[PDB]
């Protein structure tokens, strides 16, 4: 059994992109944040705590365009009790065709690894967007690096990455660009 079902007919010819959440699209902490974008109550050991969520700049332009260009998949090492509410609020266009959480990761030498071989997709047509190069140790030639984001509101990386994803969305084999 693979992590993903068969791609829907409107996704089948597109490239798959697995997209990280924390420090890629949003940043959260339990330390109170003024003027947060979302606050999500998250139960931990039977006590609800408020998780304060900041949206990385340009993330709506990014998700909205990505969902057109790709079969986008949320793939995070966090628990669904936190990720699903965040994703529900972020994904205003249905970009994420599937959601994969910590239980879908592989623990490898102290690190949760997104083993792309388990998605059920030709790896010539799979990309991973993740701020943590450890997340894609088994598939470095599938990766589009992105710097970890916390609160810098001057950041523009999601904006700056789009014309490159525009190119990638049209190739037959991502390795022809990323070299493998």
């Amino acid at each position: 059994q693979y992590l993903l079902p068969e791609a829907k007919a409107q996704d089948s010819d597109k490239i798959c992109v697995v997209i990280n959440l924390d420090e890629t699209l949003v940043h959260s902490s339990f330390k109170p944040v003024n003027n947060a974008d979302f606050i999500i109550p998250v139960e931990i050991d039977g006590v609800v705590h408020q998780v304060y969520v900041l949206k990385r700049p340009h993330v709506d332009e990014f998700l909205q365009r990505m969902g057109e260009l790709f079969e986008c998949v949320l793939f995070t090492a966090s628990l669904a009790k936190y990720a699903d509410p965040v994703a529900d609020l972020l994904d205003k266009w249905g970009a994420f065709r599937a959601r994969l959480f910590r239980e879908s990761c592989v623990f490898h030498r102290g690190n949760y690894v997104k083993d792309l071989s388990r998605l059920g997709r030709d790896l010539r047509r799979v990309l991973i967007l993740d701020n943590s190069p450890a997340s894609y140790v088994f598939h470095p030639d599938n990766a589009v690096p992105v710097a970890s984001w916390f609160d810098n509101m001057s950041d523009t990386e999601l904006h700056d990455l789009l014309p490159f994803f525009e190119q990638l969305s049209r190739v037959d084999d991502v390795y022809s660009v990323l070299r493998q």
């Binding site: 959440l21 420090e23 995070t76 090492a77 966090s78 102290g110 949760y112």
Partner: peptide, 7 residues
């Protein structure tokens, strides 16, 4: 610690 490298 929301998405942690390690538990």
């Amino acid at each position: 610690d929301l998405s942690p490298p390690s538990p």
